Amino acid sequence: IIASDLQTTKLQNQISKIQNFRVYFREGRDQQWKGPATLIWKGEGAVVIQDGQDLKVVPRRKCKIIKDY
Amino acid sequence: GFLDGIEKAQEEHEKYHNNWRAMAEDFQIPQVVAKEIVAQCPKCQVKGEAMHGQVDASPKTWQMDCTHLEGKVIIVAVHVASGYIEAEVLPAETGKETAHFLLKLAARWPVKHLHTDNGDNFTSSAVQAVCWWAQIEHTFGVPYNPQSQGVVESMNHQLKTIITQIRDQAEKIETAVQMAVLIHNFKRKGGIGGYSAGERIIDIIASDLQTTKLQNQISKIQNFRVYFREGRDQQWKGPATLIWKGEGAVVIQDGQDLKVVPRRKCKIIK
Amino acid sequence: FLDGIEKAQEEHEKYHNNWRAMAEDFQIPQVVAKEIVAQCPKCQSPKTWQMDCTHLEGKVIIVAVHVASGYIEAEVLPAETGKETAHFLLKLAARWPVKHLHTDNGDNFTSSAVQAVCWWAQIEHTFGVVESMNHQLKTIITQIRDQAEKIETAVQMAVLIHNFKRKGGIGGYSAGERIIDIIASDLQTTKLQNQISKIQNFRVYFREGRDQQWKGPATLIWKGEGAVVIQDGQDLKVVPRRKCKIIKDYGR
Amino acid sequence: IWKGEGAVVIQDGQDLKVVPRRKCKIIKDYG
Amino acid sequence: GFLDGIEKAQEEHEKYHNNWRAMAEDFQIPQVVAKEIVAQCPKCQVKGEAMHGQVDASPKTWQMDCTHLEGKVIIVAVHVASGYIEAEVLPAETGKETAHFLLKLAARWPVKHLHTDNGDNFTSSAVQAVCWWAQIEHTFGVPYNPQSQGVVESMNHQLKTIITQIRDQAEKIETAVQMAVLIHNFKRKGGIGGYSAGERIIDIIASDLQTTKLQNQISKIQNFRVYFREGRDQQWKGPATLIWKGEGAVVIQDGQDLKVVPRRKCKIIK
Amino acid sequence: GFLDGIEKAQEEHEKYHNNWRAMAEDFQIPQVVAKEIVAQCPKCQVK
Amino acid sequence: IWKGEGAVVIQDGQDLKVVPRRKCKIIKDYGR
DNA sequence: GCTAAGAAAAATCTCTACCA
DNA sequence: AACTGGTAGAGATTTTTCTTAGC
DNA sequence: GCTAAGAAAAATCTCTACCA
DNA sequence: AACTGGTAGAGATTTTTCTTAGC
Ligand SMILES: O=C(NCc1c(F)cc(F)cc1F)c1cn2c(c(O)c1=O)C(=O)N1[C@H]3CC[C@H](C3)O[C@@H]1C2
Ligand SMILES: O=C(NCc1c(F)cc(F)cc1F)c1cn2c(c(O)c1=O)C(=O)N1[C@H]3CC[C@H](C3)O[C@@H]1C2
Ligand SMILES: [Cl-]
Ligand SMILES: [Cl-]
Ligand SMILES: [Mg+2]
Ligand SMILES: [Mg+2]
Ligand SMILES: [Mg+2]
Ligand SMILES: [Mg+2]
Ligand SMILES: [Zn+2]
Ligand SMILES: [Zn+2]
Ligand SMILES: [Zn+2]
Ligand SMILES: [Zn+2]
C-alpha cells in the first residue's frame, strides 16, 4: 500500500518534469507579445501551442520557451 | 549570507526591472538565482530565440504569390528545387483566375505540392476544387510570416529588376513580363551545376524518373536477408532487406525505413 | 585501357555502335568513344514545334505540338488576329526552348507581329502531326465535357489527360516523360561537345620506347592522372605521362 | 547510394549518412 | 577562335542582357572578355559593394535624434563611447527648443562634437548660434542614411522597450520618460567592463583627464633625441623625440606624429 | 520557479534541521542556496 | 587574504604571513 | 634539358539589399 | 501533434596555369 | 593522503529584430 | 578632398570549480 504510493509518486515526478513548459509568443498583424501558453509539439522551425483552448502555430523565431529548473 | 539579498532583489526588480547582471553584482547573490528572478517576470520576456528554419525543397513542390507593378496584378509560381518561373498578368485578383492559372500549370508540369500564403484568392473554393481534381496537396504558411515562402518573394525581386532592364523594348506590360520570364529561364547561368533554370528543371525531373526505374530493377532480384541487433536493450528485430554492404557499415531497410548499422552488430543470411 | 580501346575499335568496325553504348560496355571515357565514332566515314529534332488553329463551339483553340514526343500546349483565343498569335508564341518560347517553327500559310501566322516575335526570340519560321493531335484532343474534350462549366476549363483538363494519363509507344510512357528524356539527352551532348573542344586546343610531344628523340605533334584526346590518349597518323594510342610534354597549340 | 520515400542514403567522404528527402537535390551534373 | 564569338556576344547582350557566365559558356570566350562586356553596360550596374563603415567614437562625441511616442515628441542625446542617455519631451519640434536642449546639455557635460541627421530643427540658425557660443563642432550625416547615426537609433529602440515595461506606474508620459532614463543609466549592467552607462561615463572622462596630466609630467623631463632612417629611399629625417624603447622596436614622435621603428634603423643620442 | 521553494525550505529547516542534499532534492532548489540555508543556522554545519 | 600564482597571504593569530602554495590547502568556509 | 620565379586568369569565400 | 528565408552579385583572398630567364 | 570522475556553475561565442 | 550601423538578449558550446568514491 505504501510502496505503491512511493512508486506512483516517483513516476508522477518524472512525468511532471518532462514537459511542463511555458511559451510567450508573438503573433497577429500588429505583432504584440502575448501571455503564457502550453507547449504541445516542437519541431525544427515552428511550435504548436495551446492558448485559451485555441491551437496556434508560431515560428520559433517569434517565441520564447521557459523550462523549469 | 545572501537570503535577505534575495528578498531585496525581488523588491528591486518589482520596481525597476533590473537585468540579471545588475542584481547579481549589487546584491551579491549567485547568477542562477538572479536569472530565475528575471525569468519569473511577465513584463520581461520580449525576445525570440534567434534562428531560422529551412523550407521544403522536394522535386515536385511549387510556391506561389501575387505582386503588383504599375497598377497591374502579376501572379508568379516557382519550382523550388530548380528556380524555374512561370508568371502572368491577371485582370483581377479573384479566385477564378487563380484557379485557371493553377490548372494550366498542372496541365504543363507535374505538380504534387503547392505552398502559398493566406491571401483571399488562395483560400478559395475554386482553388480547392482544382486541387481536388488534379490531386495537389495545398499547404498554407503561418499568417503574417513571409519567410515561410522565401523562394517566391526572392523571385519577385529578380523579376522586377529584369523588367526595369528591358522596359523600353516593349509597349505593354504583359509583353515585358513574358520577355523577363524568358531572360530568367534561359539567359542567366550560375548556381548548383553552373546551369540556367531550364536546364536544372530538366536535369532534376529526368534524374528522378531514371533513379526510380533503376532501383526497381535492382530490388526485384535481391536476396541476403539480414538479422541485426540494435536498440537501448540488446534485442533482435525482424526480417530486414540488405541494400548495400560497405567497408565499415551496412545499409538495411526495415519497415520502409533506411538504417546504417555497423558490421559487428549484424549477420547476413542467404 | 588500350585493350578496351582496341576492342571498341574492332566492335565499331563490325557493327557501328554508338558512343554511349561503347562507353558503358568497354569501360572507356566518353570523349574517347565520341572520337571513335567521329573518325568513321560511314557515320557522317529536339527543338521543333508545329502550330495550328482549330474551332470548337464558336471558340478558337490554338494548339502547339512537340513533334519528337507528341507533347501539347493549347489555349483559347478571344479572336484570330496576329497579336494574340504573337502573344501565344512568346509565352511558348518563354517556357520551352524553341528554335524551329512550322506553320501553314494562314493570315495570322503571316503577320508583322509574329515576324517581330520570331526576330526577337531567334526562331526559324517555315511555312507549308497537328491534325492527328487535334482529332485526339477533341475526342478527349467531348469525353470529359460534362465535368466542367466553361470551354477553357475543359480544354486544359484535356491537355492534362493527354500529357500525363495516356501511355503508349515502345516503353509505355506518357508524352511528358518523353519530352523530358529527349531534351536531357540533347543537353548531355552539348556539354560533352564543349569539353571536347576545350581539350582539343592542345598538342602533345611524346618520346617513344627505346628512342631519345621526340616524335611529331600529336593531338590530345584525353588526359588522365597517369595516362594520355593521343591521335597521330590516323591512329589512337596511349602514352604515359612520364614520356609526354603538353603544349598549347595556336592553329586556328 | 539509395533513394527512399522519405530518406536518402548518401556517401560523403567515406561517411554514410541518412538525410531527409526534403533536404536533398539529386542531379547528374553534366560538367 | 573566338573573335566572331565576341561580336556575337555583344549583340546578344544588347538584346537579352546575359550575365558573364552565360556568355562565357555559350560563345566559348574567356571570362575576362565576358566580364568586360557586362561591365561596359549602363542598364546593368545596380548593386553596391557589400560592406559597412564604423562611426566616430571619441570621448567627447554626442549623437542626437528625435522620436515620436503617443503623439508627443521625444528628443534623445547619447554619449557614444559609454552609452549614456539624456532625453526630454518637447512641446514642438522647432529649432528654439532644440537649441535650449543643446545648451542645457553643454552646461552639464563637456561637449566638443555633435552629430545629427538633416532634420529641419537641427539645420537651424538657433542651433548654429548655440554651437558657436559653446564651441561645438556640428556634423551632419549623408541624407537618407540612418546608419550614420547608429547609436542614437539603437537607443531609441531601448528607450521604447523600457517605457512599455514601466508604463503602468506613471500617469503622464513625461514621468515615464524620466523613469526610463534612470533605469537605463543606473539599473542595467553588461558591456565593456561589466558596467552600467553611468559608471562607464565616469570612468572614461576621469581616465582621459588623468592620462593627459601624467604624460605632461613625463614629457617635461625627457632627453635622448633619436635619429632614424626610413622611407622608400634610405634617407635621414630630422629631430625626433624618443617616447618609449621596447625590446624589438622603439616609439618616436616626429612632427606630432607617432611612429614605431625597429631598433636596427635608429640611433639614440644623449 | 523555486523562490517559494526557498521560503518553504527555510521553514522546514527551522523545524526539522534537514541536510542540504535532502532540501535540494525535495524542494527543487539549486545546491548553493541549500548549502547557504544550512550555513546560516547556528546549530548546524554543512558536511 | 590574497591568493597568487605561487604565494598565499593568510591572517592567523592577529598576524599576516606569506605561505607558498605547495604547503597550503584552500577549502570553502560556511561560517555565516 | 630542366627548374623555378613571376604574372595572368580562374575559382572559392564572405557579406549585403530586397522581396506589400 | 507534422512547420520552417532565399537569391544573386561585388570584392577579397587563394589556387591553378602559362611564359621565360637562368644554370 | 592523493587522484580523478562527474556534475554544477560560470564564461565565451554566434546570431537575430528593431530603430520614422 | 575629411566620411562611415549598433545594442542587447537567447541558446549553444567550452571551461572552471566543487564534492566524493576509490586506492
Ligand atoms: O511583407 C511582405 N513582403 C516583404 C518581405 C518578404 F517578402 C520576405 C521577408 F523575409 C521579409 C519581408 F519583409 C508581404 C506581406 N504580405 C503579403 C506578401 O505576399 C508579402 O510578400 C501578402 O500577400 N499578404 C496577404 C495575406 C494576408 C494579407 C494579404 O497580408 C499579407 C502581407
Ligand atoms: O528610417 C529611419 N529609421 C529606421 C532605421 C534606422 F534607425 C537605422 C537603420 F540602420 C535602418 C533603419 F531603417 C529614419 C528615417 N528618417 C529619420 C530618422 O530619424 C530615422 O530614424 C529622420 O529624422 N529624417 C529627417 C531628415 C529628413 C527627413 C526627416 O527624413 C528622415 C527620415
Ligand atoms: Cl499571410
Ligand atoms: Cl537625413
Ligand atoms: Mg502574398
Ligand atoms: Mg509576397
Ligand atoms: Mg531623425
Ligand atoms: Mg532616427
Ligand atoms: Zn521584469
Ligand atoms: Zn561508324
Ligand atoms: Zn547589360
Ligand atoms: Zn539547523
3-state secondary structure chain B: CCHHHHHHHHHHHHHHCCCHHHHHHHCCCCHHHHHHHHHCCCCCCCCCCCCCCCCCCCCCEEEEEEEEECCEEEEEEEECCCCEEEEEEECCCCHHHHHHHHHHHHHHCCCCEEEECCCCCCCCHHHHHHHHHHCCEEEECCCCCCCCCHHHHHHHHHHHHHHHHCHHHCCCHHHHHHHHHHHHHHCCCCCCCCCCHHHHHHHHHHHHHHHHHHHHHHHCCCCCEEEECCCCCCCCCCCEEEEEECCCEEEEEECCEEEEEEHHHEEEEC
Quick check: B46 and A33 CB within 8 A? yes
> Do residues B139 and B131 make contact, with C-beta atoms less than 8 angstroms apart?
no
Interface of B with E (CB under 8 A): 16-19, 21-22, 25, 43-44, 46, 161-162, 165-166, 183, 187-190, 194, 196
State the Cα–Cα distance between residues C92 and C128, nearest whole angstrom.
21
Beta strand pairing call for E266-269 and C227-232: unpaired
User: What contacts C99, CB < 8 A, 6 or more positions away?
Assistant: C47, C48, C122, C123, C124
Q: How far is CA E19 from CA C120, E23, E37, E39, in A?
A: 18, 7, 9, 10
State the Cα–Cα distance between residues B76 and B66, nearest whole angstrom.
6
> Do residues C33 and C8 make contact, with C-beta atoms less than 8 angstroms apart?
yes
Ligand 1 in contact with B119 (CB < 6 A)?
A: yes
User: What contacts E101, CB < 8 A, 6 or more positions away?
Assistant: E75, E77, E88, E90
> Do residues B83 and B185 make contact, with C-beta atoms less than 8 angstroms apart?
no
Ligand 1 in contact with B153 (CB < 6 A)?
A: yes
Residue B77: all three cell numbers together: 509560381
Nearest CA owner, ligand 2 atom 3: E146
> Do residues E81 and E204 make contact, with C-beta atoms less than 8 angstroms apart?
yes
> Which is nearest to B78 in space by CA: B174, B188, B178, B153?
B153
> Do residues B48 and A25 make contact, with C-beta atoms less than 8 angstroms apart?
no
State the Cα–Cα distance between residues B5 and C218, nearest whole angstrom.
90
State the Cα–Cα distance between residues B173 and B160, nearest whole angstrom.
12
A19: three-class secondary structure by DSSP: coil
Where does ligand 2 bind, in terms of residues with CB under 6 Å? E 65, 117-119, 146-147, 153
State the Cα–Cα distance between residues G15 and E75, nearest whole angstrom.
59
Quick check: C90 and B199 CB within 8 A? no
Experimental method reported for this structure: cryo-EM
State the Cα–Cα distance between residues B268 and C18, nearest whole angstrom.
41
> Which is nearest to A22 in space by CA: A10, A11, A33, A8?
A33
**Interchain touch D–A (≥3 Cβ pairs closer than 8 Å):** no
Cell numbers 545596380: residue: E46
> Which is nearest to E66 in space by CA: E58, E74, E78?
E74
CA of C230 to C1' of H3 (A): 27
Q: What is the DSSP string of E57-72?
A: --TTEEEEEEEEETTE
> Do residues A13 and A4 make contact, with C-beta atoms less than 8 angstroms apart?
no
State the Cα–Cα distance between residues E102 and E84, nearest whole angstrom.
15
> Do residues E100 and E123 make contact, with C-beta atoms less than 8 angstroms apart?
no
State the Cα–Cα distance between residues B159 and C84, nearest whole angstrom.
23
G29, G30, G32: which to substitute to probe chain F, counting the most F Cβ within 10 Å?
A: G30
User: What contacts D4, CB < 8 A, 6 or more positions away?
Assistant: B253, B256, B258, D21
State the Cα–Cα distance between residues A55 and B88, nearest whole angstrom.
37
Cell numbers 618520346: residue: C207
State the Cα–Cα distance between residues B210 and B215, nearest whole angstrom.
9
E243: three-class secondary structure by DSSP: strand
The secondary structure of residue A41, as a DSSP letter, is: E
Q: Long-range contacts: C135-139, Cβ < 8 Å, 24+?
A: C136/C162, C137/C63, C137/C72, C137/C74, C137/C162, C138/C54, C138/C56
Helix (H) or strand (E) holding D20: strand D16-20
Cα-based angle E114, E116, E119 (whole degrees, multiple of 5): 140
Taken in order C233, C239, C244, C246, is the CA torsion positive or negative?
Answer: positive
Was F12 annotated as part of a binding site? no
> Which is nearest to E265 in space by CA: E210, E226, E207?
E226
> Do residues G30 and F46 make contact, with C-beta atoms less than 8 angstroms apart?
yes
> Which is nearest to B122 in space by CA: B78, B73, B64?
B64
> Which is nearest to E84 in space by CA: E109, E115, E121, E113?
E109
Cell numbers 480544354: residue: C155
> Which nucleotides of chain H does any protein CB come within 7 A of?
9-11, 14-20
Q: Long-range contacts: A47-52, Cβ < 8 Å, 24+?
A: A47/A23, A49/A23, A49/A25, A51/A25
Cα-based angle C158, C162, C168 (whole degrees, multiple of 5): 155
Was E168 annotated as part of a binding site? no
State the Cα–Cα distance between residues D18 and D6, nearest whole angstrom.
10
Cβ contacts of C188 on chain D, cutoff 8 Å: 30
State the Cα–Cα distance between residues E61 and E136, nearest whole angstrom.
10
What strands, in cross-sheet order, belong to the sheet with D2-3? Answer: D2-3, D7-11, D16-20
Closest residue of chain F to G32, computed from CA coordinates? F40
Cβ contacts of C184 on chain B, cutoff 8 Å: 202-203, 206
What phi, psi does D17 have (nearest 5°)? -150, 165
Cell numbers 510502496: residue: A3
Q: Long-range contacts: F23-30, Cβ < 8 Å, 24+?
A: F27/F2, F28/A68, F28/A69, F28/F2, F29/A69, F29/F2, F29/F5, F30/A69, F30/B30, F30/B32, F30/B33, F30/F2
State the Cα–Cα distance between residues C114 and C104, nearest whole angstrom.
13
CA of A4 to C1' of J18 (A): 56
Quick check: F3 and B40 CB within 8 A? yes
Rounded to 10°, the helix F20-27/F31-39 angle is 130
Q: How far is CA C143 from CA B100, C77, C157, in A?
A: 20, 22, 11
CA of B181 to C1' of I10 (A): 25
Residue C25: all three cell numbers together: 560496355
G27, G28, G29, G32: which to substitute to probe chain F, counting the most F Cβ within 10 Å?
A: G32
Q: What is the DSSP string of chain C?
A: -HHHHHHHHHHHHHH---HHHHHHHS---HHHHHHHHHT-STT--TTEEEEEEEEETTEEEEEEEETTTTEEEEEEESS-SHHHHHHHHHHHHHHS---EEEE-S-STTSSHHHHHHHHHHT-EEEE--HHHHHHHHHHHHHHSGGG-SSHHHHHHHHHHHHHHT--BTTTTB-HHHHHHHHHHHHHHHHHHHHHHHHHTTEEEEEE-TT--SEEEEEEEEEE-SSEEEEEETTEEEEEEGGGEEEEE----
Cβ contacts of C87 on chain B, cutoff 8 Å: 174-175, 178
In single-letter form, the type of residue at position E224 comes to F
State the Cα–Cα distance between residues E131 and E126, nearest whole angstrom.
9
Which domains are assigned to chain F?
Answer: 1-47 (1.10.10.200)
